[PDB]
Amino acid sequence: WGCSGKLICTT
């Protein structure tokens, strides 16, 4: 798993 950006990942 990983992130594109941060909004979805950090919420």
Epitope: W1, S4, I8
Partner: antibody, heavy 126, light 104 residues
Framework: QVQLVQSGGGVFKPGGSLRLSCEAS????????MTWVRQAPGKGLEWLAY????????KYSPSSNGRFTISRDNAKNSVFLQLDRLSADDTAVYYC???????????????????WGQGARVTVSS | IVLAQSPDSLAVSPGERATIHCKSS???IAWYQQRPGQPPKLLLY???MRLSGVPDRFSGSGSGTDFTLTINNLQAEDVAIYYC?????????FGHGTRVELRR
């Protein structure tokens, strides 16, 4: 300022092809998957494609059938959309949009479009 | 996976309350604002979380299958088309939108 500026719209004869450009600034480009979304006059929003951070992996709407190619140039902070075999149905406004979401390997998941270009108008007519 | 959005159009007086609904066939919901001749702008995601900069009068809610966008103290700059977005389905889908006009 965090923005995406597009260019490359215009009027086109059918049967040919076009490329649209989008230039990103104000944020770290390689941290985001980029996408294209189009909106036909009157209709709603249709997601077209996404491209991964390193510009190597791209996914398309089931209705694309290979006609669309999204690509990116990280050194130039730019994303592109090429569209072949143009027809009148391709007449629409095309948006460049930044995607914030999860990735699972190269697959983009749970994504929202948090930043949008100003759009490019495309008209296809004989 | 469809998104029935309603009502299609909605007349509201300034200062009053606008209420937009979004139902899916099956909380990954996002709301977008598009003013005439303008690109879409993200307002809410996870159904209820406003993006930074979006005024407090915009609020989202929704239990499971039905979702609501609420605009309180309606302003003139709020006249736009609003789109709900389901981002847990493949591919992602949008509603056909809801026009918010002024009431006279």
């Amino acid at each position: 300022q965090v923005q995406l500026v597009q260019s490359g719209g215009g009027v086109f004869k059918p049967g040919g092809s076009l490329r649209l450009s989008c230039e990103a600034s104000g944020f770290t480009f390689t941290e985001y998957y980029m996408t294209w979304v189009r909106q036909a006059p009157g209709k709603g929003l249709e997601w077209l494609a996404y491209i991964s951070k390193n510009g190597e992996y791209s996914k398309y709407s089931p209705s694309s059938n290979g006609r669309f190619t999204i690509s990116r140039d990280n050194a130039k902070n730019s994303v592109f959309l090429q569209l072949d075999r143009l027809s009148a149905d391709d007449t629409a406004v095309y948006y460049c949009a930044r995607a914030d979401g999860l990735t699972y390997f190269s697959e983009l998941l749970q994504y929202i479009f948090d930043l949008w270009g100003q759009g490019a108008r495309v008209t296809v007519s004989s | 996976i469809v998104l029935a959005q309603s009502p299609d159009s909605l007349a509201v007086s300034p200062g009053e309350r606008a209420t937009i609904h979004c139902k899916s066939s099956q909380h990954s919901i996002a709301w977008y604002q598009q003013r005439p001749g303008q690109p879409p702008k993200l307002l809410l995601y996870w159904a209820s979380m406003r993006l930074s900069g979006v005024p407090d009068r915009f609020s989202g809610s929704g239990s499971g299958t039905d979702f609501t966008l609420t605009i309180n103290n309606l302003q003139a700059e709020d006249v736009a088309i609003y789109y709900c977005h389901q981002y847990s389905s493949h591919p992602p889908t949008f509603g056909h939108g809801t026009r918010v006009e002024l009431r006279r």
